[PDB]
């Protein structure tokens, strides 16, 4: 019957946030706080369009803003963040309870310097 109209592979070729699960979980609250606008724009247009072939620019902007946030994390508070995501990654269930000292140090550092 109908025909499908798929996007070209060049448009989908975009660099990625090549990190792990524990690194994403460690900076999850601050990423959700600072980067709310492009994420909410992407979520709204995906919910109201229901078509991933027309929902690429907002995903690109979400990815770019996430990588920018992680670059800003890398420039200022690298080593406390490394300690935080390391001790988060040691736990099997990725529990936020077993990382109170590292979380306190990380939030204090990122509040004092950013």
């Amino acid at each position: 019957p109908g025909i499908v109209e798929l996007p070209s592979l060049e448009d989908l070729k975009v660099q990625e946030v090549k990190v792990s699960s524990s690194v994403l979980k460690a900076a999850a609250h601050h990423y959700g706080a600072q980067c709310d606008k492009p994420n909410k724009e992407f979520m709204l247009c995906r919910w109201e369009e229901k078509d991933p072939r027309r929902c690429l620019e907002e995903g690109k902007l979400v990815n770019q803003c996430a990588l920018e946030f992680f670059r800003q994390i890398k420039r200022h508070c690298a080593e406390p963040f490394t300690e935080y995501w390391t001790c988060i990654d040691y736990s099997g269930l990725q529990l936020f309870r077993r990382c109170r000292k590292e979380q306190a140090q990380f939030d204090k550092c990122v509040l004092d310097k950013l």
């Binding site: 990625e16 946030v17 090549k18 229901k50």
Partner: protein, 105 residues
């Protein structure tokens, strides 16, 4: 004698489960939510005979969403062609399909 007392007393007994496109706990859609919505809203109140005679396309699309059998025939045809072309020997798989591909994230 279909005594529909569910509308006489206004009490909902089993209208919340009878249709795949109903209200679900924690708002989880099924695999054919949109097709169910189209098939209900196109064939509402006009009678079963007119619904079958006129709304056949969306019901066919819903049945294809559910059973997926035409996609099975498509996959069977391309896989038989692939097996044949490997068996005679004029086809080589790409490195992306073979496994060493380094996926997107």
């Amino acid at each position: 004698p279909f005594f529909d007392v569910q509308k006489k007393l206004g009490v909902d007994l089993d209208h919340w489960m009878t249709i795949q496109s109903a209200e679900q706990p924690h708002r989880i859609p099924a695999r054919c939510h949109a097709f169910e919505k189209e098939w209900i809203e196109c064939a509402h109140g006009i009678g079963s005979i007119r619904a079958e005679k006129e709304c056949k396309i969306e019901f066919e699309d819903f049945r294809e969403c559910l059973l997926r059998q035409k996609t099975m025939k498509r996959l069977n045809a391309i896989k038989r062609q692939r097996d044949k072309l490997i068996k005679e020997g004029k086809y080589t798989p790409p490195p992306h399909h073979s496994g060493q591909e380094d996926l997107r994230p």
